[PDB]
Design a protein around this ligand. Structure first.
Ligand SMILES: Nc1ncnc2c1ncn2[C@@H]1O[C@H](COP(=O)(O)OP(=O)(O)OP(O)(O)=S)[C@@H](O)[C@H]1O
Ligand SMILES: Nc1ncnc2c1ncn2[C@@H]1O[C@H](COP(=O)(O)OP(=O)(O)OP(O)(O)=S)[C@@H](O)[C@H]1O
Ligand SMILES: Nc1ncnc2c1ncn2[C@@H]1O[C@H](COP(=O)(O)OP(=O)(O)OP(O)(O)=S)[C@@H](O)[C@H]1O
Lengths: 7, 346, 178, 344
């Protein structure tokens, strides 16, 4: 569905 | 005829207290909206302007209460949307257009009656960037929804599904009001940076805090559009909202008035709860002021007041059903502290 | 007739021991929930208030046990969801609406009987901001989650997916949250 | 048919404070149509494409120029948005839809549509920010738009069909006006060129003075600066013409409140006239308003805030008040220290 990207 | 500003404020006074600065702002908009809707696109000056309100205040100051009470006295349609579910760029979840589709349920699919409607949003602060002008990961509710909303406030037409052919309808927003307001968090830190100008170490450095400076009400009053840019809001979004309303923190006297004067004041609600049981409930004046002092310490607003009352009468509520032949119950100031137990009348 | 705090507390004592103050809070809430529902629609005190509950305690102390034991004796619908499997702004994780969907499964999709239900959440500290003092970016399952719940506890119909592409609207102003 | 002298005068009637920008648009507009009069027939081969790139602050009149130009120009005009644009059309929109709306304005006239103008607002929205990635509003949008801007024939069902056929409408002839507010661009130009921070006695330091940061900095913009912003270099290569707009001057603000027919004083006084009381504003109040507006740095769009907040108290109690023939506003009312005095 959506997008997730982090660190 | 149309309602007057003094008449609508007298109605709001029954449900709201200590927000004179904010009541006048909403009154002029409603008056302006009806005046704009009084003439059939005929006026001495063409291209009548649209003014958008930006409600800003502390937590539990009464922002959500005004939008609810406004719809009761308002004849034209009103909607209560939320910015939490706005999905910019058509991602999963609700979309900006939804706000318009929701406005038809109250208007019963009336385009001419819907264009003259009012819109209210909440938690608008939540969609602001995290004090950063350039967005790194294309925030969906940051650098996204804020931009998406610009088109609606500016004035455009969006297709909406008529029912749940399959053709769509177009409704303009150029003559629709929007009230976007939410309790901003951390704004006092930004305002302090630009107005205190006394930080540093030294004999001639004005450093006096926690006693006089850093007042929540004073800081908000000195707010300007340039200050919101450092917070995260885009200037384009702020440009569409020229009007700004700065509410204040509830005072000790304001709490006492809100306990009795409102139609749905907590003191009255508990009396109603006790009334059905058959035992009357009375609050002694001295006791009421004590509750107000505790509420301010919590710094949770009017909503937090329920906590103090619930704890004070928690024991009595438990033992009231099992007890019998009780006509009246009196609460004392000591009971609020918890050292003493309220007296009962048989 | 209706139950009483002494009667409901005697039942919870069978499943819980050594918690005097905790039982009093839950008894008053349940005992007060039936009064607010009945005193509906031309009750002299209009606009009746609401008072949610926030349970706090150590690990393995019996927080999750109280929610389970309450459903046994509670006639009105009840559910046990969690905040870990939740994400705001319609992300890959379940949205806030999900909680309401689980309530209808036990209520047999009864909108009138769903508004008078009770709701419980476990592990609320997980969504708590993890001391994010620097505003580097916005969390996906932390601060944002709490923002989406604000409008829920006060009451606002958002959406219901029926088991037909038309959703149902369910009030949540009278629903309790633990 | 196009005239650069007259067109500048025409825009002056509706726009004020941007003289240099009017000259740039008249040249590109004249050159673009002149090219189509004799298409690739001159001796000069590989003629550069004539496009427009509007760049200015908020409330500078970017959206206004597109509206005024559409009214004056005879060919159909369109006003699209980049936020709605999405790649591979999942649920938002498609790039081809922009051509469909153009035909509705042209009434399915391919000969009349190819000579049309296109204006896309919020060009910065499509900036490629894919640091943490799929991306539907980033590279995908710019890639599709660049393909269209390059000049290609795209299938468009005329009227939607009652057929399985589509028309191959050209795109190189159609003009495009990419414009929007660039936030953070000034910092990028300032980062590249500072020429300061001299600690020596001979060296000079400028802390407040920023060498006309609002206008001069824009004038010295380069394509390489936009590359760091997020745009694709090929996209900027296709637009040799860039328009720079300086911040509105206090003198310009006064003109905007008097000359236009959409002036705040004209509409507000008209509103008061409906109530039955005339509204009077002195010249001293006008210049005072300009100083406050420039401080806000919100452009003309934020001008209304000062005027409305100042009149909040007056309008609140004006209906209850009676026997007031006229209203007089002095310069102090703008500050708010002294309340306005009514006339009976
Ligand atoms: N001025 C007021 N007079 C009386 N009661 C008030 C007032 N302001 C708040 N309250 C009480 O606080 C409750 C909640 O008010 P809200 O409008 O939600 O405040 P708020 O500022 O909107 O909080 P947010 O923005 O949702 S965090 C109301 O139902 C009232 O019981
Ligand atoms: N008061 C109690 N009396 C008897 N058994 C208890 C009591 N409190 C906890 N227990 C036991 O602990 C088990 C787990 O209780 P929980 O409600 O999960 O405790 P907890 O504090 O909620 O742990 P969390 O919430 O998952 S961190 C129960 O199944 C009981 O066996
Ligand atoms: N250059 C200008 N001269 C006069 N009035 C202006 C000017 N720019 C803006 N205004 C006023 O502001 C209103 C809206 O202007 P807009 O062009 O929409 O602002 P804008 O910043 O160009 O919009 P964007 O940023 O492209 S979405 C106009 O109707 C005018 O009243």
């Amino acid at each position: 569905x959506x997008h997730x990207x982090x660190x | 005829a149309l309602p007057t500003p003094h008449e609508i404020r007298n109605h709001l006074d029954d449900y709201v207290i200590g927000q004179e600065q904010a009541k006048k702002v909403l009154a002029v908009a409603v008056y302006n909206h009806y005046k704009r809707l009084r003439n059939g696109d005929t006026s001495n000056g063409v291209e009548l302007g649209k003014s958008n309100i930006l409600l800003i205040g502390p937590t539990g100051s009464g922002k959500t209460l005004l939008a609810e009470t406004l719809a009761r006295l308002l004849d034209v349609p009103f909607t209560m949307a939320d910015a939490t579910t706005l999905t910019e760029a058509g991602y999963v979840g609700e979309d900006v257009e939804n706000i318009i589709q929701k406005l038809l349920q109250k208007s019963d699919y009336d385009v001419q009656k819907a264009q003259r409607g009012i819109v209210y949003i909440d938690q608008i602060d939540k969609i602001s960037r995290k004090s950063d002008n350039p967005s790194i990961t294309r925030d969906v509710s940051g650098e996204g929804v804020q931009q998406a909303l610009l088109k609606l406030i500016e004035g455009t037409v969006a297709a909406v599904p008529p029912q749940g052919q399959q053709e769509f309808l177009q409704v303009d927003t150029s003559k629709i009001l929007f009230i976007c307001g939410g309790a901003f968090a951390g704004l006092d830190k930004v305002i302090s940076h630009r107005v205190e100008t006394g930080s540093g170490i030294g004999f001639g450095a004005t450093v006096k805090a926690k006693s006089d400076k850093a007042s929540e009400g004073e800081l908000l009053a000195q707010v300007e559009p340039e200050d919101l840019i450092k917070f995260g809001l885009i200037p384009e979004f702020i440009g569409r909202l020229p009007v700004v309303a700065t509410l204040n923190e509830l005072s000790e006297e304001a709490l006492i008035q809100i306990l009795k004067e409102p139609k749905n004041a907590l003191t009255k609600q508990y009396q109603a709860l006790f009334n059905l049981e058959g035992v009357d409930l009375e609050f002694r004046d001295e006791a009421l002021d004590a509750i107000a002092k505790k509420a301010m310490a919590r710094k949770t607003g009017a909503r937090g007041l329920r906590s103090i009352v619930e704890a004070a009468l928690l024991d009595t509520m438990y033992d009231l059903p099992s007890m019998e032949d009780v006509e009246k119950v009196v609460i004392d100031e000591s009971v609020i502290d918890g050292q003493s137990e309220p007296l009962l009348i048989y």
